[PDB]
């Protein structure tokens, strides 16, 4: 129905909540049997957010192979993502074991450790370079190499070492610090400036494993990031950009993990982000520099 024409119609009618509730009704429902198992109670942050059995990530160990994580595999767009929860004090070792085993090169964090006076994610990475972290359970070592702090986001350079095999790898950490829980980013230009920084780094490249994207539960703010990125990839290789349906792409994504995108305003933002980002795909190179100035990263 073409996205820009569809946007103006819904904004004039004021039916954003109705369009969103229709997506919840049509969404897939698959079993989460392993996640509900009694022994895995302390491996889940929220009892209402669980991964499906068919798309869950398995750890390479005989004891317990569980972690609250899912593989989103987008066939036509040719890109994969791993969406997980913000780790608990006891699952920090499992988190980094997954990164090693799945051969990921980048971690996208869209939340903060403490939001609204409550702990939403453990401090899984070191803040000071002289204070490295050692995860005794999985035999892994983590050290901070450098950091580049901007006004609303931070890019970190980390070194992950497998102590059993003596191998070393560089992991890039992209932390968005000003995205509130159940909220939206400040502007479409600030979101896109961040997305393209992750794209130019080489983390989303097929020579590496799937990028790890998380928040507190890893469904709300993660859904908005992944929907915008996939929609932009689809209009680049289809050669008929007007045929990309946002609502249909979100329904394909929810076949792999429950509740992607939590509010009606998060859905409205995804439209604004894709429409603005379509200008770069159309051949206008100058809009990338206009996003950097409108974001005010100083």
């Amino acid at each position: 129905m073409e996205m820009e024409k569809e946007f103006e119609q819904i904004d004039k009618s004021g039916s954003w909540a109705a369009i969103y509730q229709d997506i919840r009704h049509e969404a897939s429902d698959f079993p989460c049997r392993v996640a509900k198992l009694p022994k895995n109670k302390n491996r889940n942050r929220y009892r209402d957010v669980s991964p499906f059995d068919h798309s869950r990530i398995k750890l390479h160990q005989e004891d317990n192979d569980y972690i609250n994580a899912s593989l989103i595999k987008m066939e036509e767009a040719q890109r994969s993502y791993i969406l997980t929860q913000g780790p608990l004090p006891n699952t920090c070792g499992h988190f980094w074991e997954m990164v090693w085993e799945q051969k990921s090169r980048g971690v996208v964090m869209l939340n903060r450790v403490m939001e609204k006076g409550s702990l939403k994610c453990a401090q899984y990475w070191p803040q000071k370079e002289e204070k490295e972290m050692i995860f005794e359970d999985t035999n892994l070592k983590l050290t901070l190499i450098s950091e580049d702090i901007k006004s609303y986001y931070t890019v970190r350079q980390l070194e992950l070492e497998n102590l059993t095999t003596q191998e070393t790898r560089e992991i890039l950490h992209f932390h968005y610090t000003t995205w509130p829980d159940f909220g939206v980013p400040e502007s479409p230009a600030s979101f896109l400036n961040f997305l393209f920084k992750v794209r130019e780094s080489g983390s989303l490249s097929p020579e590496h494993g799937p990028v790890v994207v998380h928040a507190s539960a890893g469904i709300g703010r993660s859904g908005t990031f992944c929907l915008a990125d996939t929609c932009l990839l689809l209009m680049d290789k289809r050669k008929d950009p007007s045929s990309v349906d946002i609502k249909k792409v979100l329904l394909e994504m929810r076949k792999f993990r429950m509740g992607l995108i939590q509010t009606a305003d998060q859905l409205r933002f995804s439209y604004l982000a894709v429409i603005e980002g379509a200008k770069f795909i159309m051949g206008d190179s100058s809009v990338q520099d206009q996003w950097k100035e409108l974001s005010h990263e100083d």
């Binding site: 509730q21 929220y46 209402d48 507190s216 539960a217 509740g259 939590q262």
Partner: peptide, 7 residues
């Protein structure tokens, strides 16, 4: 503790 918004 819960997260999900089921309106």
């Amino acid at each position: 503790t819960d997260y999900y918004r089921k309106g």
